[PDB]
Each structure stands twice: as structure tokens, then as C-alpha cells.
């Protein structure tokens, strides 16, 4: 997960230095700046869905605590 | 169309010897998109792992 960010980065940081990405309204460029945001999403959705996961789990976690 | 508005806008700058004002603007947004990535996923990975830990210690209550 980590890892498909790095390799974002990486290929971003390819395309930057790389020739062909300098004007914006370029096809390449606007989809480059459309795939980091949909990236984003993503990842927010899967912190958000995490998130829920760890707020249930202590939920489950404090419920053993009344039992005793 | 907005496209077109850009498309003059860039000419009249390219005349006074400007460079393209986009770019500029466009590497902001990256930079800020980066950075979003990064921290949301660090974030991700530490709750992530938080619910490792939880999972661990659910699972010694039940037994």
C-alpha cells in the first residue's frame, strides 16, 4: 500500500524531470494530476473503512472490561 | 469555454515574457496532492497497525 505510493512517486517524479509533461493541459499531464487525486480518494476511503475497523474493535475491546 | 480563455491568456503572457502562469499553479496542486497521499496513508498504516494490535489482544481475552 505504501509501496503503490512509493511507486507513484517514483513515476511522478519520473514524468517531472521527464520531457513531455511541462504543459498542463497537455492529455498526459491532466491524467498524471486526475490519477494522484483518485489515489487520494482511495486512500481516504481506506483510512475512513480502517478507521471504523479500530473504533469497532474498541468497542469490543471495552465491552470485556464491564464484564469483569 | 474556460479552455480558450487560458489558451489567450497564455499568448498575451508569452509576449511580455512570461512563462506559462499554468504550470506554475499545477505543480502547487501536486504538491499539495503529494503530500495528502503521503500523510493519509501514513495515518492509514498507523491505525492499521493499531488494529493489529487490538486484534492481538481480543484474542487473548477470548482465550
Redesign the interface.
Known amino acids: 500500500?505504501?509501496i503503490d505510493?512509493d511507486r507513484?512517486?517514483a513515476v511522478?517524479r519520473r514524468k517531472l524531470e521527464a520531457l513531455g509533461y511541462?504543459?498542463?493541459?497537455e492529455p498526459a499531464?491532466l491524467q498524471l494530476?486526475q490519477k494522484?487525486?483518485e489515489?487520494?480518494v482511495h486512500?481516504?476511503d481506506?483510512?475512513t473503512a480502517?478507521?471504523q475497523?479500530?473504533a469497532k474493535?474498541?468497542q469490543?475491546?471495552a465491552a470485556?472490561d464491564t464484564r469483569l
Open positions: 500500500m505504501a505510493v507513484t512517486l511522478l511541462s504543459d498542463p493541459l499531464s494530476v494522484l487525486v489515489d487520494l486512500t481516504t481506506s483510512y480502517v478507521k475497523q479500530c474493535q474498541a469490543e475491546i470485556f
